[PDB]
Scaffold this active site. Sequence first.
Site, short mmCIF file in Angstrom:
data_model
loop_
_atom_site.label_atom_id
_atom_site.label_comp_id
_atom_site.label_asym_id
_atom_site.label_seq_id
_atom_site.Cartn_x
_atom_site.Cartn_y
_atom_site.Cartn_z
CE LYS B 198 -0.62 0.28 5.06
NZ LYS B 198 -0.08 1.65 5.12
N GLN B 286 8.94 3.85 3.91
CA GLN B 286 9.17 2.49 3.46
C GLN B 286 8.63 2.24 2.05
#
Lengths: 348, 337
Positions: B198, B286
Amino acid sequence: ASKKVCIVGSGNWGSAIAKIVGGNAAQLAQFDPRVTMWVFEEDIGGKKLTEIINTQHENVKYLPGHKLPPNVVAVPDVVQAAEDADILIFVVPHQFIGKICDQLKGHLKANATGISLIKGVDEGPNGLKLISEVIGERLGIPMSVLMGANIASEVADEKFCETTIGCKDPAQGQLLKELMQTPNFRITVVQEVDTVEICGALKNVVAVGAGFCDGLGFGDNTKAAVIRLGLMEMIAFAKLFCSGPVSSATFLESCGVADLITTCYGGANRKVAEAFARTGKSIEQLEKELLNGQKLQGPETARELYSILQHKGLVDKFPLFMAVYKVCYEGQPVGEFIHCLQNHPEHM
Amino acid sequence: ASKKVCIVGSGNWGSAIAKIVGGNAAQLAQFDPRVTMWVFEEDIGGKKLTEIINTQHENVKYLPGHKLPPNVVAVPDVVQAAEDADILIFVVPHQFIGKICDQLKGHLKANATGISLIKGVDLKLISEVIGERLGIPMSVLMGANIASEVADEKFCETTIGCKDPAQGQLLKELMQTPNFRITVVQEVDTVEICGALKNVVAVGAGFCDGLGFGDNTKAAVIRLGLMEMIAFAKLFCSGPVSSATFLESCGVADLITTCYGGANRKVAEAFARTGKSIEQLEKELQGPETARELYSILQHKGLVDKFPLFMAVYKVCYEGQPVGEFIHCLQNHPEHM
Ligand SMILES: NC(=O)c1ccc[n+]([C@@H]2O[C@H](COP(=O)([O-])OP(=O)(O)OC[C@H]3O[C@@H](n4cnc5c(N)ncnc54)[C@H](O)[C@@H]3O)[C@@H](O)[C@H]2O)c1
Ligand SMILES: [K+]
């Protein structure tokens, strides 16, 4: 030989669609360059609007500033516009589709086909009736639909977006994709017409709930749950109500999740719902203040869902849809909305 | 007879979970009311944090102002905390779970099971790291939720991925409340990979905001990102994968909230708006790192061309590609072929 297209409608959306379809019909060998567009005639300060369009190539009223292609011809009489078309593109406000079909009934070319760009839902024996069905039954033609996260102004401006085409017939689906797709207007064709179409009506009920979240000060994770449970109620309602095949995967198309998201983060249903939650003013009061009196569709659709689900005994299986109905029409305090999601069927 | 629970970790997230878990463990006969929580000992103004928790029932450093159920016992030695547990709840930051697992290895009860709440990847799933070192069946809990909101009992949902149906219902019973609603599905790997992928889509959504595009364009980017998530999961996850799992909180809901509000989106927007570096925005993600790993495995499978959103994020973050090309990269996407 080449397929003739008529765009039935010439509003904000119909003129944006003219730009694309006029472009691609002129470009592509398999389509007749001559694209008729039916224009309801209006006194444009003295000059006929259909005159202004054929001379200036600009829908000065409904898409000002944009150049409609020259091979798109305004025609004031819808029968003359559509008489020779193999493909009819229905793009008028829902309020006029009945009248237009009444004039067209019995005057179409043999084997003519249609695609509805009209978002929303009609009334019928089963409570809700899909607009594409109203059209196809009255005219006797097979119908596809085009629905997605898109708006006329951005499609005219060539801002990247996508849409879903629902078409039962693969060959006709591919034809419609070729007519409408551009580098910035990307199409996925799926075979489930009714499922693509019902999303456009149900999404506005979920958007009212999303607006309640905003107006009550809930955060994005609460709001994301409202949207997601709303999507799960959309799926479960389509599966029980729609004729034709219903797949969960269809809801991951632009007509489903993407249109849902954009409607829950921007649009009239969300905006009026948030104001209702923040200020205690009625949906009616806010309609007059914000929409010049236009009827908000989300609450009206929730009312129709309530009647359908009452006759089936399923009101308790759709707590988000039914909370929107009870808050909007039966004085359930909007501040209890979230409580109605704390025993949802999805978590049983 | 009744199942003993240990919460491995005690930060904001572990303390929030201890509020929920301690309550359900005390109420439900099937759970032992004594819930241990492994607490890295710290000196809080001269008193041990574990002693403060066990007398004031408040993690005064990581969740001040919130009472924990008194049946939750803070324990400073992680082996002592876990050695009698039937259920271990791993809720530490990603950077420590490797070391924690090296201390626990071999010291657990025989029939013990685990649930990982650690979102993000190691590409290797963190629950795989845990389950393989410790030798215990692993579940995951992932969804559109944050610790502060769970502590405050703000309505949200989550997904539990658990292969065993009886274990899943027990984990749901341990964790579920009126404001923390759980859906149990059996596709563990699918649930967990969403949490990592995501953030790639979120960077893309932030690019879209920073380029000046509207909500209909952002919704296409989110949706195409979701399709690439599904495609990649079916190609990466050794376990089963159905698109239907991505309708759960771990999929569409967490994706929506990350793409409208989160670190990956915020930076990506500012970077595309101002051409401010990344790091200076960072200091002033990330997602990109994961994009890099995606590039590497897509090479191996020969499928780089099938994931242009994922690859446009990688190329824009690491190979100089002008951010301004991001939308162009979606104009011939496999979903529209
Ligand atoms: N505007 C958008 O961005 C958008 C996006 C997606 C879908 N749609 C759908 O497209 C449909 C039409 O929307 P629109 O933007 O073109 O609205 P509009 O108000 O801009 O359209 C005006 C048109 O309605 C017709 N009309 C007006 N008065 C009439 C009268 N007395 N009698 C008969 N016809 C009359 C004419 O064709 C006129 O050109 C709607 O179903 C809408 O849901 C719109
Ligand atoms: K108990």
